[PDB]
Symmetry: C2
Subunit: 91 residues, 2 copies
């Protein structure tokens, strides 16, 4: 696999790892999302230590209102954070 | 970096590699897009050997009509292919 291909597979993997912990195994509940951010985005996003932050993040990414992050919504979240990384550095 | 973080950086890298070849260094023209697909998505997408295919792919991903793929549009493309990978395997 190319680096791009590897990257795509890594997005699927991390989503499955976390989504599979509780409840619907193809969606991230707030707790799962919190830990994904805290463990796997520790360089790109401030650690979440407040309920109000978990709440706001989920509210922001949860486009279908079910209170969880599904795969499509996780893809959008990844794009948001990737874009923020891209922009953060002037080039 | 986590695997997720690495993946995000890899998306930015591959986009820059290809977008930087010609013209606007932050957009993929048809030729750049063709080679990105052919070289870096060789396991996930059929090799592009026809103009009509390059044309259709660009038309499909080009949401702002400028005839190129920008970073946002590339993110959407990556999500599309990642999703197709995810679904292709029943689990
Ligand atoms: Ca879950
Ligand atoms: Ca389990
Ligand atoms: Ca949702
Ligand atoms: Ca270009
Ligand atoms: Ca050059
Ligand atoms: Ca465009
Ligand atoms: Zn850039
Ligand atoms: Zn799955």
């Amino acid at each position: 696999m190319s680096e791009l291909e590897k990257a795509m597979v890594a997005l699927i993997d991390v989503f499955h790892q976390y989504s599979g912990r509780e409840g619907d195994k193809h969606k991230l509940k707030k707790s799962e999302l919190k830990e994904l951010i805290n463990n796997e985005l520790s360089h790109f996003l401030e650690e979440i230590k407040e309920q109000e932050v978990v709440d706001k993040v989920m509210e922001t990414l949860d486009n279908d209102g079910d209170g969880e992050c599904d795969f499509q919504e996780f893809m959008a979240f990844v794009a948001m954070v990737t874009t923020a990384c891209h922009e953060f550095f002037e080039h």
